[PDB]
Amino acid sequence: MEISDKISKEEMVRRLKMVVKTFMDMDQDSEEEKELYLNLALHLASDFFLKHPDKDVRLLVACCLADIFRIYAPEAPHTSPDKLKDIFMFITRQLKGLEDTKSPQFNRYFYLLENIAWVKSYNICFELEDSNEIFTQLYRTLFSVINNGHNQKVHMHMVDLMSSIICEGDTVSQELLDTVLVNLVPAHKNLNKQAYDLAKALLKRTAQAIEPYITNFFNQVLMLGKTSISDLSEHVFDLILELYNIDSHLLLSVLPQLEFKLKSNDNEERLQVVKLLAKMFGAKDSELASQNKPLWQCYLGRFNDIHVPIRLECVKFASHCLMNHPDLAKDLTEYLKVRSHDPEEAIRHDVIVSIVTAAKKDILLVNDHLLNFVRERTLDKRWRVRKEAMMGLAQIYKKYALQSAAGKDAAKQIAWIKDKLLHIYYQNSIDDRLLVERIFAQYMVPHNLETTERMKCLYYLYATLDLNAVKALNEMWKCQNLLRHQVKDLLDLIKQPKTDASVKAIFSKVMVITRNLPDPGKAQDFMKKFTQVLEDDEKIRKQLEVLVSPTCSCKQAEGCVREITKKLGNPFLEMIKFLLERIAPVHIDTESISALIKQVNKSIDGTADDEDEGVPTDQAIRAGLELLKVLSFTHPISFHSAETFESLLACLKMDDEKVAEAALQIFKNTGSKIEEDFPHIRSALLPVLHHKSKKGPPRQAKYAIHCIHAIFSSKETQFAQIFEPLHKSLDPSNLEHLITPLVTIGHIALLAPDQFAAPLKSLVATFIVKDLLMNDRLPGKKTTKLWVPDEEVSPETMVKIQAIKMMVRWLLGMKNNHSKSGTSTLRLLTTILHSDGDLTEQGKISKPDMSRLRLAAGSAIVKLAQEPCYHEIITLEQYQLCALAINDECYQVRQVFAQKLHKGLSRLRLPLEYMAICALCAKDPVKERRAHARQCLVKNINVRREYLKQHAAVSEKLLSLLPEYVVPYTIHLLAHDPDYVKVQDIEQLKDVKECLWFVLEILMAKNENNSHAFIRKMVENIKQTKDAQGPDDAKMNEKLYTVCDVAMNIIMSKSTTYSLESPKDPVLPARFFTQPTKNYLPPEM
Amino acid sequence: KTYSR
Ligand SMILES: O=P(O)(O)O[C@H]1[C@@H](OP(=O)(O)O)[C@@H](OP(=O)(O)O)[C@@H](OP(=O)(O)O)[C@@H](OP(=O)(O)O)[C@@H]1OP(=O)(O)O
Same domain flag for A543 and A613: no
> Which of A632, A692, A854, A903 to probe ligand 1 with, by most ligand atoms within 8 A of CB?
A903
Residues near A274 by beta carbon (within 8 Å), at least 6 away in sequence: A262, A299, A302, A305, A310, A313, A314
A44, A45, A51, A52 alpha-carbon torsion, rounded to 10°: 0
Contacts of B5 in chain A (CB under 8 A): 123, 126, 168-169
Ligand 1 centroid vs A699 CA: distance in angstroms?
10
Spatial distance between the Cα atoms of A741 and A727, rounded to a whole number of angstroms: 8
Spatial distance between the Cα atoms of A1036 and A1027, rounded to a whole number of angstroms: 7
Same domain flag for A501 and A642: no
Spatial distance between the Cα atoms of A725 and A691, rounded to a whole number of angstroms: 12
Would you give the end-to-end CA distance of chain B in angstroms? Answer: 13
Would you give the end-to-end CA distance of chain A in angstroms? Answer: 141
Contact B4 A73 (CB under 8 A): no
Closest CA to A444 of A479, A411, A475, A417: A417
Q: How far is A119 from chain B, CA to nearest CA, in Å?
A: 5
Residue after which a domain boundary falls, among A135, A170, A205: A170
Ligand 1 centroid vs A703 CA: distance in angstroms?
11
Roughly what angle, to the nearest 10 degrees, separates helices A571-583 and A520-536?
80
A405 strand-pairing partners: A407
Q: Estimate to the nearest angstrom the gap between the alpha carbon of A685 and the chain centroid.
A: 44
Spatial distance between the Cα atoms of A833 and A819, rounded to a whole number of angstroms: 24
DSSP string, A552-621: --HHHHHHHHHHHHHTT--HHHHHHHHHHHHHS-SS-SHHHHHHHHHHHHHHHS--SHHHHHTS-HHHHH
The total domain count for chain A is 4
Residues near A601 by beta carbon (within 8 Å), at least 6 away in sequence: A647, A650, A651
A484, A487, A492, A498 alpha-carbon torsion, rounded to 10°: 170
Neighbours of A412 (CB within 10 A): 11
A526 strand-pairing partners: none
Contacts of B3 in chain A (CB under 8 A): 73-74, 119-121, 123-124
Which amino acid, residue A106? F
Residue A250 per-residue DSSP state? G
Spatial distance between the Cα atoms of A906 and A941, rounded to a whole number of angstroms: 10
Phi, psi of A407 (to 5 degrees): 95, 180
Q: Which of B2, B3, B4, B5 to mutate to test the interface with A (most CBs of A within 10 A)?
A: B3
Atom 34 of ligand 1 has which residue's CA nearest to it?
A699
Same domain flag for A539 and A629: no
Neighbours of A603 (CB within 10 A): 23
The answer to whether position A32 is within a domain reads: yes
Atom 5 of ligand 1 has which residue's CA nearest to it?
A699
Same domain flag for A565 and A625: no
Q: What is the CATH number of the domain that holds A280?
A: 1.25.10.10
Spatial distance between the Cα atoms of A937 and A916, rounded to a whole number of angstroms: 9
Same domain flag for A35 and A127: yes
A1010 membership: H or E segment, kind and range:
none
Residues near A309 by beta carbon (within 8 Å), at least 6 away in sequence: A271
Same domain flag for A578 and A625: no
Contact A118 B2 (CB under 8 A): yes
Q: Estimate to the nearest angstrom the gap between the alpha carbon of A572 and the chain centroid.
A: 26
Same domain flag for A572 and A608: no
Spatial distance between the Cα atoms of A889 and A836, rounded to a whole number of angstroms: 10
Distances (CA, A) of A122 to A45, A73, A157, A165, A716: 16, 12, 13, 8, 121
Residues near B1 by beta carbon (within 8 Å), at least 6 away in sequence: A28, A73, A74
Q: Angle at the Cα of A451 (from A447 to A454), degrees rounded to 5? A: 55
Which amino acid, residue A389? A
Neighbours of A381 (CB within 10 A): 8
Distances (CA, A) of A62 to A17, A20, A43, A107: 12, 10, 13, 13
Distances (CA, A) of A85 to A54, A91, A144, A176: 21, 10, 22, 18
A913 strand-pairing partners: none
Q: Which sign does the torsion angle of CA A111, A117, A123, A125 carry?
A: positive
Closest residue on chain B to A122 (Cα): B3
The answer to whether position A963 is within a domain reads: no
Spatial distance between the Cα atoms of A104 and A742, rounded to a whole number of angstroms: 117
Q: Estimate to the nearest angstrom the gap between the alpha carbon of A782 and the chain centroid.
A: 57
Which amino acid, residue A797? T
Same domain flag for A34 and A166: yes
The answer to whether position A599 is within a domain reads: yes
Name the 3-class secondary structure at A405: strand
Residues near A524 by beta carbon (within 8 Å), at least 6 away in sequence: A510, A511, A514
Q: How far is A50 from chain B, CA to nearest CA, in Å?
A: 23
The answer to whether position A647 is within a domain reads: yes
- What number of CA atoms fall less than 13 Å from residue A498's CA on the CB side? 8
Report whether A752 contacts A716 (CB < 8 A). Answer: yes
Peptide bond into A1031 cis (omega under 30): no
Same domain flag for A23 and A163: yes
Q: Which atom of ligand 1 is nearest to the CA of A698?
A: 28
Name the 3-class secondary structure at A407: strand
The boundaries of the domain holding residue A694 are 590-729
Contacts of A73 in chain B (CB under 8 A): 1-3
Contact B3 A28 (CB under 8 A): no
A34 strand-pairing partners: none
Q: Which of A67, A115, A164 to mutate to test the interface with B (most CBs of B within 10 A)?
A: A164
Residues near A4 by beta carbon (within 8 Å), at least 6 away in sequence: A12, A48
Same domain flag for A334 and A396: yes
Q: Estimate to the nearest angstrom the gap between the alpha carbon of A145 and the chain centroid.
A: 61
Residues near A718 by beta carbon (within 8 Å), at least 6 away in sequence: A686, A689, A690, A708, A712
Phi, psi of A415 (to 5 degrees): -70, -10
Residues near A175 by beta carbon (within 8 Å), at least 6 away in sequence: A132, A136
Spatial distance between the Cα atoms of A931 and A775, rounded to a whole number of angstroms: 39
A84, A87, A89, A90 alpha-carbon torsion, rounded to 10°: 170
The answer to whether position A115 is within a domain reads: yes
Spatial distance between the Cα atoms of A461 and A476, rounded to a whole number of angstroms: 15
Spatial distance between the Cα atoms of A454 and A554, rounded to a whole number of angstroms: 11
Spatial distance between the Cα atoms of A207 and A224, rounded to a whole number of angstroms: 24
Name the 3-class secondary structure at A387: helix
The answer to whether position A416 is within a domain reads: no
DSSP string, A769-829: IIIIIT--SSPPPP-S-S---GGGS-HHHHHHHHHHHHHHHHHHHH---TTSHHHHHHHHH
A407 strand-pairing partners: A405
Same domain flag for A621 and A647: yes
H, E, C per residue of A186-247? HHHHHHCHHHHHHHHHHHHHCHHHHHHHHHHHHHHHHHCCCCCCCCCHHHHHHHHHHHHHHC
Phi, psi of A405 (to 5 degrees): -75, -10
The answer to whether position A836 is within a domain reads: no
Q: What is the resolution of this structure in A?
A: 2.7
Residue after which a domain boundary falls, among A702, A729, A756: A729
Closest CA to A349 of A339, A359, A358: A339
**Pure H helices in A26-80:** 31-44, 47-50, 55-72
Q: Which of A26, A114, A123 to mutate to test the interface with B (most CBs of B within 10 A)?
A: A123
Residues near A254 by beta carbon (within 8 Å), at least 6 away in sequence: A214, A215, A218, A240, A243
The answer to whether position A329 is within a domain reads: yes
> Which of A801, A811, A859 to probe ligand 1 with, by most ligand atoms within 8 A of CB?
A859
Closest CA to A1007 of A963, A960, A1070: A963
Closest CA to A410 of A366, A376, A442: A366
Spatial distance between the Cα atoms of A796 and A742, rounded to a whole number of angstroms: 13
Spatial distance between the Cα atoms of A842 and A243, rounded to a whole number of angstroms: 105
Contact B5 A126 (CB under 8 A): yes
- The b/e string for A577-588 (b: 16+ C-beta within 10 A; e otherwise) is ebbbbbbbbbbb
Q: How far is A203 from chain B, CA to nearest CA, in Å?
A: 20
Spatial distance between the Cα atoms of A950 and A516, rounded to a whole number of angstroms: 14
Task: Ligand 1: list residues with CB < 6 Å.
Answer: A 699, 702, 805, 863, 900
Spatial distance between the Cα atoms of A882 and A830, rounded to a whole number of angstroms: 7
Q: Which atom of ligand 1 is nearest to the CA of A665?
A: 3
Q: How far is A358 from chain B, CA to nearest CA, in Å?
A: 54
Looking at the partner chain, which of A28, A118, A120 has a beta carbon nearest the beta carbon of B4?
A120
Q: How many CB pairs under 8 A join A and B?
A: 23
Same domain flag for A303 and A384: yes
Spatial distance between the Cα atoms of A847 and A853, rounded to a whole number of angstroms: 10
Residue after which a domain boundary falls, among A535, A553, A583: A583
